[PDB]
Amino acid sequence: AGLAVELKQSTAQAHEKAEHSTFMSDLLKGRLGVAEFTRLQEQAWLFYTALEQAVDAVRASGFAESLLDPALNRAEVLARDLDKLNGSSEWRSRITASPAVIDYVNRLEEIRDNVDGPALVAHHYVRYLGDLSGGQVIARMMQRHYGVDPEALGFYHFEGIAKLKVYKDEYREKLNNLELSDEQREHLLKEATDAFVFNHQVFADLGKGL
Template sequence: MTASVAEPLSLALKASTAQAHDLAENAEFIKKVVGGELDVAAYTALLEQTYQFYAALESMSRGLQNDPIFALIYDETLMRLPQLRKDLRALHGSDTWRENLTMLPATARYCVRLAEIGALADGPAALAHHYVRYLGDLSGGQVIAVMLKRHYGVNEEALNFYRFIGIDKPKKYKDSYREKLDNLQLTEAQREHVLDEAARAFRHNMEVFGDLKELTGI
């Protein structure tokens, strides 16, 4: 009897998160920001929350860079914190944004989960969050940057987050990333954990968007 061959992890992730991905893309706050219906202040609020959960994401990532599973997709080139700092400095006109930074409840929950994953040295869960955020940034970042320039006049010095220095061909990089996912030697339990945690990552992002919607009074 021939054993069944598991679907490649990259395809399983894409399929299992398709609905969540669509919901995140069409979240009211995000649609209005990208569609030019809000203002630079709303985008700045988004970036401030993004900075905080990326601080947690990248702290977790560095802590697990030698994990036997997570190490296979870990890449310093993807790190966004320096770019986010530049963007927030440009948007605020100085570094005073650090003094007034507030963390929304959904962002706090997201950061707590990322810290838990780091403390547990949970490589599969770390991989899931890494996949959801960074591949999303590589996929939609350029389009978002164009929309921000068009609708709000955001200049280049405030759009560093969407530029990946060292990655000249995002599609080629993403293809290589997916190939690494497909070559991972995971148990069935680890594989299911990755899929479940990816769905959880999308939920965290949706909750942040929900809090931002309330904050901006949409």
């Protein structure tokens, strides 16, 4: 099978475990509220910011340039979401990374400084293709359960993408057409597993004290 299929197969168990996260299932089923949704997006702003510096570096190196579409950038869209959710830009100087996000960001800075192309693509697949594939569902649940205004949900919609099912097919075809050595390929597949572990840990830190 091509890269896109084995990525899906090798992370399918982690995706199902993520859906059963105590924090995330509580958020999605309506048992939390807007404040907790805002906490999650603050942590996301931190690791999307680090992710996009690593993407900038790997793109500048020439690796997987076509896959690393800048239209996918989420950090400034999240910042505008958060100015609306919090009522001011005051959160920017205030939020601190949870331990999970500290480690996640550390790894993304390691990938940026090593210009580790294969590892970055793994993180790119896990965040952005997950966003593209399920973001509309999550945003709808925040509307339905908590009345979150759509203009605070821009993170879940990609403005510069017209046909969504077509874009996702092309993304997977670019994954399939990536040229990789056997070792690079094992490095990428392992990193995809790690990227799900990191995201699961972020959920665990957010669930603390609840």
